[PDB]
Amino acid sequence: EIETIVRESEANRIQAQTWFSHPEKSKVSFRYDERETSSIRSISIETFLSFYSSKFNREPYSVLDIGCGQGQVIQYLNSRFQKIELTGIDSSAQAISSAKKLGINASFICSNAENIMQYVSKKQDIIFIHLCFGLFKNPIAIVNTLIHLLSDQSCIYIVDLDRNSLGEGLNTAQSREEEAYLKDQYRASLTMEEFKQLLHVVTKEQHGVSFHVGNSFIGGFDETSSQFFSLMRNRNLQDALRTSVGEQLKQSQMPALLHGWIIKNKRYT
Numbered sequence: 624e625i626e627t628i629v630r631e632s633e634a635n636r637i638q639a640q641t642w643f644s645h646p647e648k649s650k651v652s653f654r655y656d657e658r659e660t661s662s663i664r665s666i667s668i669e670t671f672l673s674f675y676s677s678k679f680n681r682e683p684y685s686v687l688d689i690g691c692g693q694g695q696v697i698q699y700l701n702s703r704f705q706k707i708e709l710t711g712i713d714s715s716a717q718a719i720s721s722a723k724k725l726g727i728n729a730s731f732i733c734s735n736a737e738n739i740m741q742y743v744s745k746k747q748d749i750i751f752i753h754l755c756f757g758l759f760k761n762p763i764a765i766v767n768t769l770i771h772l773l774s775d776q777s778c779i780y781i782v783d784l785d786r787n788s789l790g791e792g793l794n795t796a797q798s799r800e801e802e803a804y805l806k807d808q809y810r811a812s813l814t815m816e817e818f819k820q821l822l823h824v825v826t827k828e829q830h831g832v833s834f835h836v837g838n839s840f841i842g843g844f845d846e847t848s849s850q851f852f853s854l855m856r857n858r859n860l861q862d863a864l865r866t867s868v869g870e871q872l873k874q875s876q877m878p879a880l881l882h883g884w885i886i887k888n889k890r891y892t
């Protein structure tokens with residue numbers, strides 16, 4: 624079913640991606656994303672760091688950022704850890720050029736995520752796909768490729784738009800062009816059920832691999848579930864929650880996002 628949904632929806636994902644590949648449209652998307660999603664990005668990073676520590680009882684050694692933009696995630700991670708192997712990939716040359724100007728000890732690659740194996744061979748502890756999964760022409764193929772790059776103790780963490788959150792998404796727009804941008808992005812997005820089906824398809828074909836999907840603000844983990852408690856106790860995630868969307872303004876206008884994990888814990892003989 625999901626393979627069909629993905630294929631028939633391909634034009635919608637092509638249209639969404641125009642907002643990142645043309646200079647004028649890219650100004651609109653960059654402004655919106657940095658104004659509205661920067662806080663979310665911090666929360667998402669602290670979420671995966673906290674999850675990784677709780678799940679594997681160690682810190683990650685390597686992180687790969689898919690659709691890394693101007694390298695904001697990699698910069699955040701670079702200041703957090705003294706030693707960590709960092710890689711970012713993005714198909715926008717302008718984004719990668721900007722990322723390289725940060726002067727960080729990290730590898731930035733300009734290519735379609737499809738081609739990652741031609742650039743990266745070392746296994747990754749965390750592969751992060753933040754607010755860009757709906758832009759890929761072939762998302763099933765991408766994830767299958769990335770699973771091959773996962774280390775012994777690893778996860779793919781995907782955060783993306785929920786198709787059903789369109790109304791709330793539009794409330795955040797501050798211009799008609801932002802409305803147009805968001806409409807195009809949401810048209811490319813999946814429902815929660817479709818997202819869950821997608822992760823089911825890519826994981827049950829893999830040894831030592833489980834998955835989790837949810838709408839909960841904290842990593843999609845239900846507020847009666849186990850990982851939720853570990854996360855809510857985490858000092859770093861708590862810090863991020865305070866000053867991310869901790870302004871006045873009375874209300875926040877928060878569209879619910881999809882949160883997906885592909886978790887690998889290889890058992891050796």
Ligand SMILES: Nc1ncnc2c1ncn2[C@@H]1O[C@H](CSCC[C@H](N)C(=O)O)[C@@H](O)[C@H]1O
Binds near residue numbers: 692737755
């Ligand atoms: N096939 C592909 N491979 C790699 N990057 C892609 C891609 N399609 C789109 N992108 C990139 O995905 C990004 C979406 S916007 C930036 C998302 C970033 N992860 C963040 O959370 O802020 C753009 O920089 C765009 O150039």
